[PDB]
Design a protein around this nucleic acid. Structure first.
Lengths: 341, 341, 150, 50
DNA sequence: GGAGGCCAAGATCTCAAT
DNA sequence: GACCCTTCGGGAGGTGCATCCCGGTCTCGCTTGGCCTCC
RNA sequence: UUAUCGGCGAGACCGGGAUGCACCUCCCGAAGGGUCU
């Protein structure tokens, strides 16, 4: 049982984006910032932890082996517990007196739950944020505009029947009229919404009620729209993402890692390298990364760490260096006493 | 018998967070503030003191020795006394007030209980809070949202058998229904809660009773669910933490420290450097720090202190300078008259 | 605090006897520290005069600065009044935890009997917590109707 | 459990996708290899024909 | 054998709360 | 090496879901006799 | 200022689990021209 520190960097082969609920606002899409509004963004360690945990879940599922039909022996509750640490069966207790010593056996039988814990069992794996090395390594990507298919290309008009061409005519006319109505409602909506800065405290509730009623009227105007509910032609708001080729410093660790647990974690990293995609916006191929981590250990009471090896993930392959890491992976693979159920 | 003042800084490698009972509210998780609601946060000296006290306890456990089975000679009571400072059997040598040199023998034989003390024995070690140097060196981290692994990744459905697929469908339908019901109950509850500001206290009591009963209704509705009591899909509320790279100024002191007790404290700092983690939310690797302390002593009656050396804790190692600190460590490691039981 | 500092200054100045024991006995120690006379051997000046103890004030500077019972002290030390308006806050806090429920590596050190003792301790703590919570609930119920009581 | 069947029936909506149905195809940006590979073009001016 | 020193015993009960 | 002439517009979404728990301390501001060892 | 003298103090890690994600072509038209070894 030794602590392994994974110090390294993440290089983005494609833009890297994420939509954290608190990070975004009504102004638009934003990355979570390290400090305040005008601070350097970071890629959350929560997303990296989730991706690596689901990679480890798939590693365990493949190791267990599927049946002839291709089904897994695990129950739905067991899949949920391994990949998301959720006890749908309602059996998890945080401070059971009898569980005081039963944690060790559960860890020894279930490497994934030991690594990535659950409610009541601490997880040995800590995965930190990714913080860019330089400045101006983020930007606004993805901005676009959905078009009308049949106005951009008129050669598709001859495919439609005569009755459907009238359907498109009604679509376009209804889009125009509904858009002008909704834009008028919006421009009066924002006109009084700007009054929020300097307004009476008592009238503040009514201004909230006024804007809410305007929203109801907008929804009612959209509801009476027949052919389509939402206009086809619209600009797409951009999202904020790290630039291609950004260098993000990342730090991971496993506290008191058994050889089997460290092997499971490295196997999760190896499986993650098949699809090294973090974050969201899978379309536009956002999220593809290329990372190298240097594994170091530190025996308490010593003064200097020891380097075990380096884990390099590249689009051309995965490199594991150092006899220790190979020993860890082997130790994980050759253990048949695991019970993930 | 000297006073050692550890003046230095704690540099943050990963966000530093802590949950203090009196600091967190229903509104959200907040760091403890340096007086007031709008003041600058700080990292509690209690957390640092506890971490260093447990590090010193493990130093003592390793120094005493472990048998072939890896068991320490200390029973449960000794462990609780050395780490928590609490006695369970009631055998602690209570010193009636008025005793001359009350802890003399205990302090001479037990450097850990001399440094950190217990009830009735003042500890020589005082570990203060960490104060940031600048402004906006804190922010809301964490965030994110738990998600159905089978709604996100459809390829996971292939593992599930038909019965479990149907169980998943029932689980999701139940989650939606319960969410709607609890939502309505919450709307009524917050209506009464916004009515709680009524001047009449009697009404406020009545509203509190009704809010309590509505919370019971929410719990009842959650119990009615059969698949999973808790909703799987839910946003995760952020926690407040110091940003990465925050510089926090720290002060620690040992009052009338012999060579042996100072050596034990320095060995605790050395062992702390192996896992330099403060605070919680370690699942996101929060809490890694690097710190450097300048050790000074001040002989009473003189006008200036004298610097003894410097302790630098970095991810690349522990640096200790000055022959006096080495002398302290050697004095601790070469004194064989310590009885920790 | 400053009187203790002055007492320490005097102790350092006077030094230690040849045997290494402090030359102050309990009576002199309490005269210098607390200002009480425990054996009744102190001079009792007449109440009429104000400029009393001139000889004692000349010989013992500490008693002159910080007085004793029967001799007013020359040192006045005032309060430390804050300047701002939000310069106080609820510090400290925290919460004592269980060293074996927080760090699982510590359980490896315990033997089987000690682990059983820990389990018994946790169970007893939970049971007592529940029982005491019930008693406090009943006590608070009494308190609420106490004002309405005759 | 309806995605699999739907994706098998409709390869196009499987590839590119729709609201609520993830698309398997990701098509990233095109980044120039070198430098000074972009410039102002077109321009010109409309002129009286006559 | 005072003489120093410790320890247990003696009545009933105290409302103020951002 | 003299100078014209600087454009129009369309269109901006929709959803979920908001957790569980511990566990709240000990003194003391007096005097005197009974009794244990001590010089 | 109805006198005088008196530090309130000691011990305590609040911590544990969670991928925020899904769909969208921004397009359309335009000679920059003319005088002088």
């Amino acid at each position: 049982m030794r602590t392994l520190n994974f110090n390294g960097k993440i290089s983005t082969l494609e833009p890297l984006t994420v939509t954290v609920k608190n990070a975004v606002s009504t102004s638009g899409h934003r990355l979570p910032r390290n400090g305040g509004f005008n601070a350097a963004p970071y890629f959350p360690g929560t997303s990296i932890r989730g991706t690596l945990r689901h990679a480890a879940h798939k590693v365990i599922v493949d190791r267990v082996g599927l049946n002839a039909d291709g089904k897994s022996p695990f129950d739905l509750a067991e899949h949920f517990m391994l990949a998301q640490g959720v006890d749908i069966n309602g059996e998890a207790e945080t401070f059971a007196p009898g569980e005081i010593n039963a944690g060790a056996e559960l860890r020894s039988k279930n490497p994934l739950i030991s690594l990535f814990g659950r409610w009541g069992l601490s997880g040995k794996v800590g995965i930190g944020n990714a913080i860019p090395d330089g400045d101006n390594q983020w930007g606004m990507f993805g901005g676009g505009a959905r078009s009308i298919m049949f106005q951009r290309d008129e050669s598709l008009m001859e495919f439609l029947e005569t009755d459907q061409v009238d359907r498109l005519e009604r679509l376009l006319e209804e889009q125009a009229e509904a858009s002008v109505d909704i834009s008028q409602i919006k421009t009066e909506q924002d006109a009084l919404k700007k009054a929020m800065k300097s307004a009476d405290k008592d009238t503040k509730a009514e201004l909230q009620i006024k804007v809410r009623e305007l929203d109801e009227k907008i929804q009612a105007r959209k509801d009476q729209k027949q052919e389509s509910r939402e206009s086809i032609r619209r600009p797409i708001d951009p999202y904020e993402a790290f630039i291609t080729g950004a260098e993000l410093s990342h730090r991971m660790s496993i506290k008191n890692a058994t050889d089997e647990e460290a092997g499971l974690f490295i196997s999760a990293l190896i499986r993650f390298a098949a699809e090294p995609r973090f974050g969201g916006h899978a379309n536009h191929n956002c999220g593809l990364v290329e990372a190298h981590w240097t594994v170091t250990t530190w025996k308490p009471g010593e003064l200097v760490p020891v380097t075990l090896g380096e884990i390099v993930i590249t689009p051309n392959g995965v490199e594991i260096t150092g006899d220790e890491l190979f020993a860890m992976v082997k130790a994980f693979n050759e253990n048949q006493s695991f019970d993930f159920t």
